[PDB]
Design an enzyme around this catalytic site. Structure first.
Site, PDB file in Angstrom:
ATOM      1  CG  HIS A 141      33.270  51.729  46.385  1.00  0.00           C
ATOM      2  ND1 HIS A 141      32.550  52.287  45.352  1.00  0.00           N
ATOM      3  CD2 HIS A 141      33.204  50.388  46.213  1.00  0.00           C
ATOM      4  CE1 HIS A 141      32.074  51.324  44.583  1.00  0.00           C
ATOM      5  NE2 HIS A 141      32.457  50.163  45.084  1.00  0.00           N
ATOM      6  CG  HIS A 198      28.689  48.298  47.109  1.00  0.00           C
ATOM      7  ND1 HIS A 198      28.079  47.763  45.994  1.00  0.00           N
ATOM      8  CD2 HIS A 198      29.990  48.471  46.783  1.00  0.00           C
ATOM      9  CE1 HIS A 198      28.975  47.620  45.034  1.00  0.00           C
ATOM     10  NE2 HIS A 198      30.143  48.042  45.488  1.00  0.00           N
ATOM     11  CD  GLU A 231      30.739  48.865  41.636  1.00  0.00           C
ATOM     12  OE1 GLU A 231      31.105  50.054  41.613  1.00  0.00           O
ATOM     13  OE2 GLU A 231      30.747  48.187  42.665  1.00  0.00           O
ATOM     14  CB  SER A 256      31.379  55.797  46.454  1.00  0.00           C
ATOM     15  OG  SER A 256      31.992  55.147  45.352  1.00  0.00           O
TER      16      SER A 256
END
Ligand SMILES: [Fe+3]
Length: 308
Positions: A169, A174, A214, A233
């Site tokens: 993730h 990110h 997010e 992700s």
């Protein structure tokens, strides 16, 4: 009163003493709960994060074959979707991550390498994180362009699933966006808004973060693309978020901040940003409404927050 917030980048070192000490991996529901080797491995990563001090290179770790396999499955399955679903900024930098950082199916990139790469792009840096940080602490690090990120990987039994952030993730979701100057600036603005903000406002900021960093969607050309780390992700949701099913509202911090969300199901609605610069401006204005007895400013030269 006003809550403590770090004033220099090194002060972020105090966060290690205020994380949740009982990991999700201790939960009977966790895929690796009954796996003693996994449990031990998680403890090992937690110890690395715990002893980490700002300014030190992030320790390199030899990942097990089993761990590389999981990374490999996730990498290969998600990569097919990027050219068509990920925002321009994501696609522009990915090849470079593949080249200088070793983003490949057979190799889990080392955080130190990725950190060095982000620093040369936007001055962003990574710090390994043990457990769950409070919203206040996690957000605070952003003010210094520091991203706290996990070094461990999800359990190999369910490669396409994770009840918590893990290295897949962080790296596939990110990192690429942190390589962009506009997003870096946007992220940092969220970070500055939280320094010394009251608890109820940290929660509003955490909610804006959720719907942007997010799960954000952004306008591109006359199209819509994903830039949210949680979407980039997640194989299922990345395909879903750009289908006809979700409800898309325009990013409006007044409303986004008060919005409710799920953490186990796909999001029934997403906020679309015009651009990262626009979103940053919106955060700037919103921060203007946080009842704070002072104003903060970051000095990149000395890496200190200036209280005005
Ligand atoms: Fe995340």
């Amino acid at each position: 009163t006003v809550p403590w917030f770090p004033r220099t980048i090194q002060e972020l070192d105090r966060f290690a003493n205020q994380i949740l000490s009982y990991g999700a991996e201790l939960d009977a529901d966790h895929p690796g709960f009954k796996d003693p080797v996994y449990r031990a491995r998680r403890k090992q990563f937690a110890d690395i994060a715990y002893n980490y001090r700002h300014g030190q290179p992030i320790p390199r770790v030899e990942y097990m074959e089993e761990e590389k396999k999981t990374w490999g499955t996730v990498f290969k399955t998600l990569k097919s979707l990027y050219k068509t679903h990920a925002c321009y900024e994501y696609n522009h930098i990915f090849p470079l991550l593949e080249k200088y950082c070793g983003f490949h199916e057979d190799n889990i990139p080392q955080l130190e390498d990725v950190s060095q790469f982000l620093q040369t792009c936007t001055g962003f840096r990574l710090r390994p994180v043990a457990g769950l940080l409070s919203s206040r602490d996690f957000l605070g690090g952003l003010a210094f362009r520091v991203f706290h990120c996990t070094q461990y990987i999800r359990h190999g039994s369910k490669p396409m699933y994770t009840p918590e952030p893990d290295i897949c993730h962080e790296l596939l979701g990110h990192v690429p966006l942190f390589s962009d100057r506009s997003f870096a600036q946007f992220s940092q603005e969220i970070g500055l808004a939280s320094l010394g903000a009251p608890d109820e406002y940290i929660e509003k900021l955490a909610t804006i973060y959720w719907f942007t960093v997010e799960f954000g969607l952004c306008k591109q050309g006359d199209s819509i693309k994903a830039y949210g780390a949680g979407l980039l992700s997640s194989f299922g949701e990345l395909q879903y978020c750009l289908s006809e099913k979700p409800k898309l509202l325009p990013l409006e911090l007044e409303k986004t901040a008060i919005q409710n969300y799920t953490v186990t199901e796909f999001q029934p609605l997403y906020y679309v940003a015009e651009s990262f610069n626009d979103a940053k401006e919106k955060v700037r204005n919103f921060a203007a409404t946080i009842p704070r007895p002072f104003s903060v400013r970051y000095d990149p030269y000395t890496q200190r927050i200036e209280v005005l």
